[PDB]
Design a protein around this ligand. Structure first.
Ligand SMILES: COc1c(N2C[C@@H]3CCCN[C@@H]3C2)c(F)cc2c(=O)c(C(=O)O)cn(C3CC3)c12
Ligand SMILES: [Mg+2]
Ligand SMILES: [Mg+2]
Ligand SMILES: [Mg+2]
Lengths: 239, 147, 98, 776, 83, 98
C-alpha cells in the first residue's frame, strides 16, 4: 500500500540524522584521550591480536581484515590510509605505529599497497592502554551485539595537546597544533600544585607549539590570543 | 570551545577517576583470595576427620552437604586469624553468621568446594608453609590499598 | 532448442532452454544480433530475452518466407550453440606429471 | 481446604487481569463464551449435536448440552469428588469465583445429581437426587454484582452473531438461543455452513451468477476450505479464520489466496483470447472489485505475531492454500462456461473504466539489442513502450545495482545506478551543473530536458520514479540531495506525484522451519516481547491460576516505554535512583508541609538504595526548608568514583509528567507477586525473585536455537530476497512525496542546503541539542 | 608392571598419583575406573583385529563409500545420445 | 585449511570475506589478494562447480556475465560436503610442511 508524506518532514529528519551522526561519531576527537573512533578501534584490535613492540611484525592485510570484520563497518582503503598516517615521522610528533617498508616521504611520494608492508605497536602506545583489564573504563556494543569495544582509553599521556587534531564536520570544524611533552608535563604539575593558576602562569612552562618539521614561528600575539579564548592566527616561515 | 586550562583540568580529573577504579578492583580481588586462603588453611589441621568423612560419602554432593553441617575447631591457626584485626580481610558480601564465631569456624559452600579440589601433593611439609607467607603479604597489601 | 508453430496464423518461433558449458548468454545474444545485422543469416525478424524465475527462455522470431530448420542448422553451425571440448587428463603422480 | 480459598482470594484481588475489562462488560460475555466453548468441545464428540442456551430474566444464563456427562467419580489424590476437582482446582474457576452461586447438575447412568457452589466454596458433596435416562450436563450461574459493574445485563445480538458463526463453522451442530425477558427462540442448523455463510452474506446485494465455487481438502495436516461468489458491488470483503478464530489483518493464507486468484484469472483470460479482442489488460485489483469470500484453515499449532491474534505468521500455510486454490479453480471455469463470461465482462468493464482516467501520452523508443537510441551506457532499459506502465529505479551503488539488475521483471522495470555522492545543485552554478556527468546522464535518462527554455514535463519517459538507498546514515544524505535536485529543477514532477521512496527490511529471524522479516527496531522489540510469552505461565503464588497474555503484554509494553523515558533523562538524575521510585509510595503534594513524613520517606529511600549495591558508592539524605509557604524539599547526595553530587527534588519535579508516569506504572506492580512466585513451562519449574528476573529468565529461555541476521546494506542480500521483499508489486510498501505549504519549503531548503553556515549551525544547535535534553 | 603379585610404578605414574583430588575418594569414582577399563579392553581388541587382516580392512572402506553415496547422491542432468 | 582453522563451520554464522582473505594472505599464501578473492568466488558459483565447496551470501555473479561485488560487501562459510574432505585431519593421517 502507498501512504503519503510531506517533503519538509522527510528533509528535516534525514538531515538531522546525518548531521548528528557525523558530529558525534566520525569527525571530532574526545577531550580525554584525543582520539577519533577509528583510531581507537585500530589500536584496540592491534592490542587484542597480541602485536607488541618487542615481537615480530605482522602483515597489514591481516590487521585491516580484523578491524573491518569485527569493529568497523566501512571500506578498507580508507582504514589503510588512516593506519599509514599514524606511522609517518613528518605527520605525528610522537608516532603510534612502527612500520617496516615503503611508507612515503616528505617529498610527496605515496606509500605502497597493503600487500607489501608490515606493522606493530610503538613503545609509547602501550601507555595509552595501561590497566585496561582492571575495569577502569566502560565497554559498549558493536554493530551486531557480538563484540565489545572500550568507550575511552585509560591514557597516561595528554595526547590531545601533544599530537593535535584536525577534522571537518557539519556546521563546525577543529584545528589544534602539536606541542612538546616535557612542557605539558610541567604545566600539569604546576596546575596540580596551584589549582588557581592563571594563563600567564601556565605560559611560563608552555611558550607555544612545536611542529615535527621545525622551522620558525613569526610573532607572539596569536599564540596568547588563542590560549586565552580559543581562536587565533599564527604565521609559519621556512628557514 | 575550550582553552588551555580546561584541557588540563579534564586530563587531571580523568586520571583521578582511573586511579580510584583500579584501587577498588584490586582491593576486591585481594579479599576474595584471602577468603579461600583461610578456608584451605583451616582444613589442614583436621585432616584425619576430613578424610574419614569423605571416604564414607557415596556422592560428592553428599560430601559437600556434610562438610557444611557442623563447626570445626580452629587448632593451630587461631594465632594468624587473631592477627587479622576486626574484618579488614572480610568480603563485603559475606553474611554475619559465617566465619569465626567462638573458637569454631563455620564454612560456606564455595569453601567446601575448594576443599574438595585439594590435590594430594599439598600435604607435604614444605607446601604448607606458603599459606602463612601469602596471608601476611595479602594483609599488608590490603592495608596499603585501604590507605 | 525447439520449434513451435502457431495454430492460427501458421507462424513459428524458436525457443532455447539450455546452453553449453562455459558460455556467456549476453555475449551470445550480442553475437547473434551482430551476425544478423549484416545479412549473414536469413529468416530472423526479432530477437529478445524473456528469462524469468521459472527458467531460461530465449525467443527468436522466424520470418514468413522461410522454414525454421534451415535457420536452426545455420545457428548451430555459426554460433556458440554447439562447441567442442578437448579432453586432456594430466595430473601429478609421485611429484611427476603423467 | 485452605489453598483453594487462598487462590480464590488471590484471583478476587485483581479480577481484571484474569477476565479482562469489567467496565464495558467484555469479561461478562467472555465467561459465557468460555462456557459455550467448553460445552461445544464436549458436544464435538457427542453422540448428537444439541446445545441449549437460555437468557433468563433474573440476570442469569443456563446452558445445557447433550454430550457425555461429566463423570461423578472420586479423586484418588485429593479424596474428593472428581466433578469438584474438575470445576475448582488450580477456565470455569474464574467464572465460579466471579459468580455468587453456581448450579452443578450431572445426569448420567440413569440417575440425577445436584450440587450448589457458593462463591467457589462447595456446600455439600454431590448426591443423587433423582433418576433419569438421558446423558448430559447443565450449568446455571449467577454473576457477582459487586465485581461486575456498569453492565449487569446480557445482549441478544452479541451472543447470536457468535453462535451463528460457530454454527456456520461447526457443520452439523445445532444451537438454540432463547431469552426469557421478552420471549424469543432462534435455531441455527446448516450442513454446508461455509456455502450457507456465503449465501447469507451475499443476500442484500445482487449476485450475478447462481453457481458458487466451493471445495474442502486436507493435505499434510492442513485443512483448507474456500467459498466465494461475485456480486454487483464495488467493494471486496474477505473473511479469514484459523481454528475457529478470526483474523482481521489476514496473514499468509490471504496472500496465497490473492496470488492464486490473480494468476488463475490472468492465465484463463489470456488463453481464451478475451484480452486480445479488447485492447486492455486487467490487474489484480480489477478482479477483486465486488467479491465475498470465506477462508478457514485447520492447523495443529498456529503461531501468531501477538497475543491478541489478528495475524497468522506460519510459513507452509501460504504454500498449501496457494496450491489448493490454483489446482481446482481452473476446472471450475470450464465446468461452468456460462457464469465464467459474466465475471470476465465485469472485469473488462472495470479495466476499461480505469484506463479512461489516465493522462495523454506518446509512445517512446526503448533501448534494445539492435539499437542504442542515444541513451547512456549504464542504463538497463525495459521492453514496454507505454510510459504510463513503466517504472525507473535509482540505486545507490554498483553492487546493489547489479543485484537489482539480476532480480527484476525485465518486462516493465528499468535500473539506473548511481556511483559516489552526487552534486549539490543548491551551492553550484548552472554551467557547473551542466558539465557534471552524473547529472547529465540522469537528465538524459529522464528525457524531459532542462533549462526552463526546453523543459517540457509532458515528455517524461517513465511515470514512476523510485528512490532506493541503504538503511544507514549515508543513505539519508543521498536522499536529501536527490530531493533537492528534484524540487529545485523539476517542480511539476513533484506536483503531479511521480516520486516514490522504497522501504527495504532490516532484520531476518529464523528458528528451525519458521522464518520472518522484520521492518525496524520497534517491530523487533514487539517480536521479542511476544516470542517470550508463549508456552509460559506466571502465578503470583503457588496455588493461583495463570494470568492473561494480553495483560502481560500491556504491562511489558508500558514498562518498556517508561524505561525509554527514564533512559532519556539520564543526564540530570542517576539511573538507579529513578528505578527505585517505582517501588515506593507516592509522595503527594500534600506532604510538602508536614516536615515529618518527608524525612521518613527520604530515609527509607536512601536505606533501600544503600542495601542493594554492587559497585562502590554511598547514599545520603538531607532536608531543605524554603520560606515560600514553608516548603520542605528532599535532597539526595551520592558518591561515585570519588565525586560527590547533589540532586535537589524541588516542587516542580513533584508535579510533572515523569513522576506521574512513574507512579502510574508503579501502582500496577506494587505487591503483585507473592512469596511463592513460581513460573512453570511445559515440563520445568522455576521460582521467581522479582518481575525483572522472571522476564530475563524467559528471554534467555526463548533465545535458545534462534538465529538473527542484520543487513548492513543492499549488497548483502541475495537477488531473490531483494525482489520478494522490495520489488514485487504484490507485497511491497512505498511512500509518495507531496508538498503541503510551498512557502516554508523554500525557507527550509535555503536554510539547510545554502552557502551560509551560521543559520545551519543555529538550526542544528536549537533542534537536535537543546530540545532533546528537555522534552517536557 | 605386575611381576610376582607386586606392582612396580614408574615416574609418570607416581606423578599422576600425586595429582589426585580429594573428591575422587567417594564411592562412584571407584567404579568409574572399572567401567572405563573394561571399555578400553574391548576397544583395544577391536582395533587389533583390523590390523591383522585385509578383508576386515576392505569392509570398512566399503561401508564408508556406501554411506557417502547414500548421503550425497543425486540425479543426472546431461543427456548422452548417439550421433 | 584457513577456513577450517578459523572455525568457520557449516552450521554457524557467516564471516566477512575480507577477514578470511587477510588470514590466508598473512599466514600461508605469499602473493596478491585480488586473485585469492577471485579464486574464492569461483568455488561458490552453482554454474561453475558440480558440487560447490563454499556457501555464500550476497551478490556472486550470474550466468548472464555479471561480476561479483567487491570483498567489502559479501560473506562466506564452509559447505556441508567440504567437511568430508578434511575428516580425521587431527589423527596424524597426512604429513605437514613449513
Ligand atoms: C567509483 O567511485 C569512486 C570514484 N569515482 C566516482 C566518479 C563518478 C563516477 C565515475 N567514476 C568517478 C570516479 C573515485 F574517484 C574514487 C573512489 C574511491 O576512492 C573509493 C574508495 O573506497 O576509496 C570508492 N569509490 C566509490 C565508492 C564511491 C570511488
Ligand atoms: Mg579512495
Ligand atoms: Mg553503506
Ligand atoms: Mg587483477
Amino acid at each position: 500500500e502507498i501512504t503519503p508524506v510531506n517533503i519538509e518532514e522527510e528533509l528535516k529528519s534525514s538531515y538531522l540524522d546525518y548531521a548528528m551522526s557525523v558530529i558525534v561519531g566520525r569527525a571530532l576527537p574526545d577531550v580525554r584521550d584525543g582520539l577519533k573512533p577509528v583510531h581507537r578501534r585500530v589500536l584496540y584490535a592491534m592490542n587484542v591480536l597480541g602485536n607488541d613492540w618487542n615481537k615480530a611484525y605482522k602483515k597489514s592485510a591481516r590487521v585491516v581484515g580484523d578491524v573491518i570484520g569485527k569493529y568497523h563497518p566501512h571500506g578498507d582503503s580508507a582504514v589503510y590510509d588512516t593506519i599509514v598516517r599514524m606511522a609517518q615521522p613528518f605527520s605525528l610528533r610522537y608516532m603510534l605505529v612502527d612500520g617496516q617498508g615503503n611508507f612515503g616521504s616528505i617529498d610527496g611520494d605515496s606509500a605502497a599497497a597493503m600487500r607489501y608492508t608490515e606493522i606493530r605497536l610503538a613503545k609509547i602506545a602501550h601507555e595509552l592502554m595501561a590497566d585496561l583489564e582492571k575495569e577502569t573504563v566502560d565497554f559498549v556494543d558493536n554493530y551486531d551485539g557480538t563484540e565489545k569495544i572500550p568507550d575511552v582509553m585509560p591514557t597516561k599521556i595528554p595526547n590531545l595537546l601533544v599530537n593535535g587534531s584536525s577534522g571537518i564536520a557539519v556546521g563546525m570544524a577543529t584545528n589544534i597544533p602539536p606541542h612538546n611533552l616535557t612542557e605539558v608535563i610541567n604545566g600539569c604539575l604546576a596546575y596540580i600544585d596551584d589549582e588557581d593558576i592563571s594563563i600567564e602562569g601556565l605560559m611560563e612552562h608552555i611558550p607555544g607549539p612545536d611542529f615535527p618539521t621545525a622551522a620558525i614561528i613569526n610573532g607572539r600575539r596569536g599564540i596568547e590570543e588563542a590560549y586565552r579564548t580559543g581562536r587565533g592566527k599564527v604565521y609559519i616561515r621556512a628557514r | 570551545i575550550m582553552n588551555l586550562k580546561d584541557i588540563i583540568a579534564a586530563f587531571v580529573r580523568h586520571r583521578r577517576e582511573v586511579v580510584t577504579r583500579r584501587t577498588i578492583f584490586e582491593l576486591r580481588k585481594a579479599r576474595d583470595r584471602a577468603h579461600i586462603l583461610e578456608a584451605l588453611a583451616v582444613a589442614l589441621a583436621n585432616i584425619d576427620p576430613i578424610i574419614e568423612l569423605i571416604r564414607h560419602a557415596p556422592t560428592p554432593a553428599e560430601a559437600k552437604t556434610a562438610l557444611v553441617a557442623n563447626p570445626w575447631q580452629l587448632g593451630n591457626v587461631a594465632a594468624m586469624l587473631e592477627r587479622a584485626g576486626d574484618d579488614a580481610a572480610r568480603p563485603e558480601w559475606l553474611e554475619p553468621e559465617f566465619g569465626v564465631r567462638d573458637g569454631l569456624y563455620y564454612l560456606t559452600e564455595q569453601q567446601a568446594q575448594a576443599i574438595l579440589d585439594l590435590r594430594l601433593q599439598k600435604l607435604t611439609g614444605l607446601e604448607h608453609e606458603k599459606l602463612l607467607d601469602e596471608y601476611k603479604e595479602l594483609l599488608d597489601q590490603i592495608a596499603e590499598l585501604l590507605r | 532448442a525447439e520449434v513451435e508453430v502457431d495454430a492460427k496464423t501458421g507462424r513459428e518461433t524458436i525457443i532455447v532452454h539450455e546452453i553449453p558449458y562455459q558460455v556467456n548468454k549476453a555475449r551470445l545474444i550480442e553475437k547473434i544480433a551482430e551476425l544478423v545485422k549484416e545479412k549473414r543469416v536469413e529468416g530472423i525478424s526479432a530477437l529478445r530475452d524473456e528469462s524469468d524465475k521459472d527458467g531460461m527462455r530465449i525467443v527468436i522470431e522466424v520470418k514468413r518466407d522461410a522454414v525454421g530448420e534451415v535457420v536452426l542448422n545455420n545457428l548451430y553451425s555459426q554460433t556458440q550453440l554447439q562447441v567442442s571440448f578437448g579432453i586432456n587428463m594430466v595430473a601429478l603422480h609421485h611429484g611427476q606429471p603423467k | 481446604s485452605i489453598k483453594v480459598l487462598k487462590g480464590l482470594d488471590a484471583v478476587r484481588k485483581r479480577p481484571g487481569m484474569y477476565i479482562g475489562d469489567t467496565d464495558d462488560g467484555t469479561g461478562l460475555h467472555h465467561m459465557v463464551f468460555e462456557v459455550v466453548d467448553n460445552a461445544i468441545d464436549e458436544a464435538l464428540a457427542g453422540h448428537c449435536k444439541e446445545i441449549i442456551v437460555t437468557i433468563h430474566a433474573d440476570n442469569s444464563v443456563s446452558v445445557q448440552d447433550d454430550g457425555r456427562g461429566i463423570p461423578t467419580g472420586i479423586h484418588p489424590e485429593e479424596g474428593v469428588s472428581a466433578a469438584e476437582v474438575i470445576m475448582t482446582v488450580l477456565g470455569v474457576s474464574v467464572v465460579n469465583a466471579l459468580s455468587q452461586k453456581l448450579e452443578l447438575v450431572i445426569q448420567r447412568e440413569g440417575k440425577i445429581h445436584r450440587q450448589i457452589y457458593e462463591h467457589g466454596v462447595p456446600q455439600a458433596p454431590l448426591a443423587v437426587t433423582g433418576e433419569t435416562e438421558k446423558t448430559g450436563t447443565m450449568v446455571r450461574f449467577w454473576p457477582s454484582l459487586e465485581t461486575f459493574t456498569n453492565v449487569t445485563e446480557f445482549e441478544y445480538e452479541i451472543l447470536a452473531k457468535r453462535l451463528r458463526e460457530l454454527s456456520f463453522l461447526n457443520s452439523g451442530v445445532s444451537i438454540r438461543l432463547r431469552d426469557k425477558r421478552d420471549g424469543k427462540e432462534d435455531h441455527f442448523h446448516y450442513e454446508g455452513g461455509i456455502k450457507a455463510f456465503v449465501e447469507y452474506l451475499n443476500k442484500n446485494k445482487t449476485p450475478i451468477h447462481p453457481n458458487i465455487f466451493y471445495f474442502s481438502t486436507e493435505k499434510d495436516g492442513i485443512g483448507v476450505e474456500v467459498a466465494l461468489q461475485w456480486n454487483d458491488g464495488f467493494q471486496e470483503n474477505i473473511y479469514c479464520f484459523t481454528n475457529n478464530i478470526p483474523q482481521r489483518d489476514g496473514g499468509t493464507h490471504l496472500a496465497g489466496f490473492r496470488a492464486a486468484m490473480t494468476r488463475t484469472l490472468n492465465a484463463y483470460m489470456d488463453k481464451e483470447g478475451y484480452s486480445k479482442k479488447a485492447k486492455v489488460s486487467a490487474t489484480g485489483d480489477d478482479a477483486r472489485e465486488g467479491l465475498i469470500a470465506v477462508v478457514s484453515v485447520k492447523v495443529p499449532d498456529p503461531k501468531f505475531s501477538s497475543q491478541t491474534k489478528d495475524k497468522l505468521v506460519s510459513s507452509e500455510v501460504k504454500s498449501a492454500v496457494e496450491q489448493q486454490m490454483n489446482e481446482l479453480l481452473a476446472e471450475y471455469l470450464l465446468e461452468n462456461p456460462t457464469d465464467a463470461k459474466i465475471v470476465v465482462g465485469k472485469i473488462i468493464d472495470a479495466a476499461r473504466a480505469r484506463e479512461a482516467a489516465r493522462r495523454a501520452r506518446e509512445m517512446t523508443r526503448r533501448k534494445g539489442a539492435l539499437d542504442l537510441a542515444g541513451l547512456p551506457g549504464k542504463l538497463a532499459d525495459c521492453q514496454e513502450r507505454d510510459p504510463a506502465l513503466s517504472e525507473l529505479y535509482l540505486v545507490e551503488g554498483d553492487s546493489a545495482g547489479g543485484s537489482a539488475k539480476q532480480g527484476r521483471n525485465r518486462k516493465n522495470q528499468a535500473i539506473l545506478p548511481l556511483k559516489g555522492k552526487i552534486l549539490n545543485v543548491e551551492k553550484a552554478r548552472f554551467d557547473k551543473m551542466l558539465s557534471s556527468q552524473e547529472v547529465a546522464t540522469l537528465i538524459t535518462a529522464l528525457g524531459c530536458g532542462i533549462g526552463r527554455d526546453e523543459y517540457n514535463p509532458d515528455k517524461l519517459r517513465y511515470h514512476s520514479i523510485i528512490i532506493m538507498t541503504d538503511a544507514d546514515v549515508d543513505g539519508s544524505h543521498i536522499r536529501t540531495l536527490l530531493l533537492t535536485f528534484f524540487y529545485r529543477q523539476m517542480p511539476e514532477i513533484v506536483e503531479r506525484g511521480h516520486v516514490y521512496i522504497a522501504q527495504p527490511p532490516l532484520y531476518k529471524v529464523k528458528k528451525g522451519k519458521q522464518e520472518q522479516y522484520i521492518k525496524d527496531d520497534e517491530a523487533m522489540d514487539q517480536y521479542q516481547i511476544s516470542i517470550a510469552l508463549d508456552g509460559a505461565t506466571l502465578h503470583t503464588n503457588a496455588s493461583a491460576p495463570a494470568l492473561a497474555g494480553e495483560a502481560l503484554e500491556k504491562l511489558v509494553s508500558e514498562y518498556n516505554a517508561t524505561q525509554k523515558m527514564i533512559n532519556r533523562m539520564e543526564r540530570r538524575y542517576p539511573k538507579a535512583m529513578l528505578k527505585e521510585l517505582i517501588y515506593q509510595p507516592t509522595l503527594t503534594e500534600a506532604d510538602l508541609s508536614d516536615e515529618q513524613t518527608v524525612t521518613r520517606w527520604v530515609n527509607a529511600l536512601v536505606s533501600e538504595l544503600n542495601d542493594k549495591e554492587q559497585h562502590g558508592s554511598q547514599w545520603k539524605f538531607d532536608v531543605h526548608t524554603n520560606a515560600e509557604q514553608n516548603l520542605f524539599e528532599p535532597i539526595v547526595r551520592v558518591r561515585t568514583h570519588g565525586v560527590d553530587t547533589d540532586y535537589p527534588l524541588d516542587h516542580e519535579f513533584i508535579t510533572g509528567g515523569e513522576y506521574r508516569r512513574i507512579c502510574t506504572l508503579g501502582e500496577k506492580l506494587r505487591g503483585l507477586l507473592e512469596e511463592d512466585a513460581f513460573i512453570e513451562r511445559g515440563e520445568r519449574r522455576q521460582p521467581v525473585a522479582s518481575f525483572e528476573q522472571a522476564l530475563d529468565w524467559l528471554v534467555k529461555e526463548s533465545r535458545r536455537g534462534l538465529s538473527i541476521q542484520r543487513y548492513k546494506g543492499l549488497g548483502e542480500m541475495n537477488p531473490e530476497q531483494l525482489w520478494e521483499t522490495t520489488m514485487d508489486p504484490e507485497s511491497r510498501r512505498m511512500l509518495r512525496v507531496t508538498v503541503k505549504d510551498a512557502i516554508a519549503a523554500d525557507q527550509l531548503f535555503t536554510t539547510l542546503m545554502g552557502d551560509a553556515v551560521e543559520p545551519r549551525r543555529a538550526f542544528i544547535e536549537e533542534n537536535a541539542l537543546k530540545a532533546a535534553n528537555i522534552d517536557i | 608392571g605386575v611381576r610376582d603379585g607386586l606392582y612396580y610404578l614408574t615416574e609418570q605414574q607416581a606423578q599422576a598419583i600425586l595429582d589426585l583430588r580429594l573428591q575422587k575418594l567417594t564411592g562412584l569414582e571407584h567404579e568409574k575406573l572399572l567401567d572405563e577399563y573394561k571399555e578400553l579392553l574391548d576397544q583395544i581388541a577391536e582395533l587389533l583385529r583390523i590390523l591383522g587382516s585385509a578383508d576386515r580392512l576392505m569392509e570398512v572402506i566399503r561401508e564408508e563409500l556406501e554411506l557417502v553415496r547414500e548421503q550425497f547422491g543425486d540425479k543426472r542432468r546431461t543427456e548422452i545420445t548417439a550421433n
